[PDB]
Structure formats: structure tokens, C-alpha cells
């Protein structure tokens, strides 16, 4: 049985700049397991009806997972533009899969500031779809940075610093993006 549970019920999620990816293969997929994971702030599929998923056979399912703030959930969608979509998690324009987000103020917001969830702030070139960039190289606007991030020296990751009293726009949201891949290889993720 496909371990969708392990994705959705994990203790902590990844920062979006270093998102996780669980390949999901050679398993029976019961997507009803998904439904029983608390009300979802977002459940917008792409190229597929969610209500038909047990009728479909895929050769891979990819499960990507990360945390972003509320207003940015808009950016987890094909063709999107901005800090998150262009530097952390780009989706391809022919995307077939689902994006599932939900408020996790309760598990990720802390009163002294949760600085462990980080986003990439800038990047000379955008990510190819599904690309991941774990870099932390300081950037020098000044024509000599060394280990000093100062005035014209810039660190490229920042911290959401979640706090329970932030408006729902800046609260932590757990995203699972599910990518259904269709090759000529015998389909190994099916219903029951």
C-alpha cells in the first residue's frame, strides 16, 4: 500500500528551498487515505479529476512536501511567478497532479519565532521545473564577502519566523504536491 500516510502525517516538513520528494512506486494506492487528514485549505488538481484517482494507473507518483506561508500557496501552481515559484519550487506548465495545502499554525508556529523554516530570497536564474537548490552562498553586490554577510553582502535564505499571532496570511501551511507520471513502463501505482 502506497505510504501517502507517511507524507501527510510526518512530524515536521521541509523548508521549501530544500523540499522533500518521496517517490511512490510498486504499491497499491488508496487515495481515500488522503481525505482523512483534516480540512484542506487547498486541493486543486491539474490534468486529472481527484474523484477518479482510484480508476487510474500511473508508473510513478511523486510526493513533494514543504512549508510556506498562507499568501504564498497561490504560487504552488503551474505557470506561477514570484519568490517561491521561481526560486524554491517551480511547477512545469504541463503539470498533472494535485496541490494540497493546510494551515499548520498549531504544529509550526512558536511564540519566540520558528526560524527553522526558510525560503530562498533571490536567485540569478529561476529553477527549471522540479529543480532543487540547497546552496547558501553569500552574494556580493559590492565589486569581497568572505564569511561576512553585511551591507552589500547578502545571505540568500531568510526565515519566516512563524508566531501564533500572525494573520492567516503569514501562518505556516503544509503543502503536499503529488505528481502523477505516465510513461510506457508498466503502471505500478494503481487503485484496489
Amino acid at each position: 500500500l502506497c505510504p501517502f500516510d507517511e507524507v501527510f502525517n510526518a512530524t515536521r516538513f521541509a523548508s521549501v528551498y530544500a523540499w522533500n520528494r518521496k517517490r511512490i512506486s510498486n504499491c497499491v494506492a488508496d487515495y481515500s487515505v488522503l481525505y482523512n487528514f483534516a480540512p484542506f485549505f487547498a486541493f486543486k488538481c491539474y490534468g486529472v479529476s481527484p474523484t477518479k484517482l482510484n480508476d487510474l494507473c500511473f508508473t510513478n507518483v511523486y510526493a513533494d512536501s514543504f512549508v510556506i506561508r498562507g499568501n504564498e500557496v497561490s504560487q504552488i501552481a503551474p505557470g506561477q511567478t514570484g519568490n517561491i515559484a521561481d526560486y524554491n519550487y517551480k511547477l512545469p506548465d504541463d503539470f498533472t497532479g494535485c496541490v494540497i495545502a493546510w494551515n499548520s499554525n498549531k504544529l509550526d508556529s512558536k511564540v519566540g519565532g520558528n526560524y527553522n523554516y526558510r525560503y530562498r530570497l533571490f536567485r540569478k536564474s529561476n529553477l527549471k521545473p522540479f529543480e532543487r537548490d540547497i546552496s547558501t552562498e553569500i552574494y556580493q553586490a559590492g565589486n569581497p564577502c568572505n564569511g561576512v554577510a553585511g551591507v552589500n553582502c547578502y545571505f540568500p535564505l531568510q526565515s519566516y519566523g512563524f508566531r501564533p499571532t500572525y494573520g492567516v496570511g503569514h501562518q505556516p501551511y503544509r503543502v503536499v504536491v503529488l505528481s502523477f507520471e505516465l510513461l510506457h513502463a508498466p503502471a505500478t501505482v494503481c487503485g484496489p
Partner: single-chain antibody
Amino acid sequence: EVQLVESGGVVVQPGGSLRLSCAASGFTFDDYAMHWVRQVPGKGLEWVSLISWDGGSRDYADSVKGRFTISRDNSKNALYLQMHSLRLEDTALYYCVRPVYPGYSSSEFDSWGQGTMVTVSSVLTQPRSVSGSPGQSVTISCTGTISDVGAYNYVSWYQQHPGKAPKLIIYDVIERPSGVPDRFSGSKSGNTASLTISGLQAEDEADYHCCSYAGNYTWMFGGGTTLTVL
């Protein structure tokens, strides 16, 4: 140490054509997206065009599409804006701008040339003028849509004193570049972002402009004057 010198401004007849030029130095040009912004008579700051660090991506304001062509030549550290089919509406002071950060969607512009006047002859909403007294606290509105201000967390405010280019004083809704004193704060609710100034000095008798990312690869500004009553 960053220097942007514009050039090309001249009086042109409508229908005419003209090529503006930017020369860059003081940063690695090769990394940044480069923008053009114009200062229209009466109507404030107007974003024009931007071109990716390698010239492969170019976007344009609707008022300009398919009459203006942005381009660059990194070997010369240069950035050009070729103009065709010029119109009265295009009369403006044309600025050459580089954003604070690299990347195509950088939404904060801390570097501005002096601007090159371009004359042709044969919109987010801001209070026009606002007034406070030294020490009191004024605020300034910036109303857009859910596709510009209300859509993203990339709202910026720029200050401008006479004969100077815009100076970036607030970026990413609530951030302050080094040296901006903290009596300048910024906020955003719905499609309205606000610049608030406390502890009001008379050196804040100036003009104040906001800018938001507007989706696709596109930006928009406004226009507003403060008089510190003396």
C-alpha cells in the same frame, strides 16, 4: 559605488524613434535583471520594461508593448531601450534601474540613474498631497488590486527629493535598507499598503512613491507629496 548613467534623451516628433542608453558600473552587471522606469509629467512613476541577466527574457508595460524594445550588451555593461512610434504619452524622464537583488522577479529597486528627458512634440492610487506637523505622524495610502498589492508581499516605497532619483526606503512590505531610520514604517491590508512616518523631520518634505509586483514579470507605481507644515 554603483553608478548608472543614462543617455539619449532628445526632443522627437510623434511617429519618431530614439534609442536610450544606460552605462553600468560598481556591481557585476552580468548577474542582474535591468529595468527602465519613467517619470511622466503629472502622473508619477511608471515602470516600463525589464530584461533578464542574459537577455533571454524581456517584459514590457502594456502601454509600451511592441513599440519599445529593451536589450543589453554585457560585454559593454550596457543596457539600451529602443523606441519606435513615439507618442505624447511617452514624454517622460526615463530612468535606468537595477534591483536590490539578482533574479528576474526582484521587486525592490535601490539603484537609479539620473534620468534622461525624452520629449515628444510636433496605476496604483495615492493621496496627491498630505500634511503633518513636525513630530506628528502621517500615513500614505497605496491602493491597488488583488492582482498587484493584494496579490504579493513585494510592496516598496521610494522617497525622492528635488533633483535626485528615487531612494528606496521600504521594501518587501515591512523591510528597511541600511540607514533608513525606523520612523519610516510600512504595512499592507487588503489591496492597500501604507507608509507611516513618525517623529517627522522637515528633511521629509519630499515625494513618496509605492511600487508593487503585479504578476507575470510586471510592476506598477503611484504618486504622493508631503508638506511638513512649518
